[PDB]
């Protein structure tokens, strides 16, 4: 089971800035999608599921 | 010390307190026209202050004036005198259809 390798180095510092959320991968994705919605504003079905 | 520090005083922007429509006016039991503006047209019932908008003091003066005027022979009890149906409507009550 691909449990991610230890999420911190020898010094104990987590690698990801959202580590302490406990859901860094999910919230890193929400952060990236929320950021894209912002940039668009500044600039401005059957086939798949 | 410092000139720009705040100074103690009373609120200069304070607004005056609200006043009822009858604040500062004498309520006489003989002035049936005024008293009639605070009774029901169909039943003669005295309106509460939530309908008349009067303050506690004037609500009492009007009530006492109506009761005096009614039993002394100046004002009807069971209905508003029809002569006063076209006076200014100062009461927050809607009746008809």
């Amino acid at each position: 089971p691909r449990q991610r390798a230890i999420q911190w180095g020898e010094d104990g510092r987590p690698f990801h800035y959202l580590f302490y959320t406990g859901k860094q991968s999910y919230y890193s994705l929400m952060h990236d999608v929320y950021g894209m919605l912002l940039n668009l504003e500044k600039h401005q079905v059957i086939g798949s599921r | 010390s410092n000139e720009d520090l705040p100074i103690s005083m009373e609120n200069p922007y304070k607004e005056p307190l609200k006043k009822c429509i009858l604040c500062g006016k004498h309520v006489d039991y003989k002035n049936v026209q005024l008293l009639s503006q605070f009774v029901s047209p169909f039943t003669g019932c005295i309106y509460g202050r939530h309908i008349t908008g009067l303050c506690g003091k004037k609500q009492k003066e009007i009530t006492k004036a109506i009761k005096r005027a009614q039993i002394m022979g100046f004002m009807p009890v069971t209905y508003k005198d029809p002569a006063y149906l076209k006076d200014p409507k100062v009461c927050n009550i809607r009746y008809r259809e």
């Binding site: 504003e41 | 410092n2 720009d4 520090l5 705040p6 922007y13």
Partner: protein, 100 residues
Amino acid sequence: NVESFASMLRHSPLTQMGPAKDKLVIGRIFHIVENDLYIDFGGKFHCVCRRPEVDGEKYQKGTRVRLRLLDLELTSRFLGATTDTTVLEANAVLLGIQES
């Protein structure tokens, strides 16, 4: 000759305005959600005004608008509460757009 805080506060436009009720101010739309315009006017909190029916498309992010202020912060204390409930927004009426 360093300006003190008491001096900044005395001569600030927000201090000079006095009470905010029925005061005309210039706001700036900084965020838009559908037909809800989020407008900053220099206070602690923004106000939220619905897009006007006429010339709705003229109101965009960055558009400067004219407002009539009612409250800088909408707060009320309800029965049985030790503090005040705040919605964290100002109350204002959107009049139109500011143009030169």
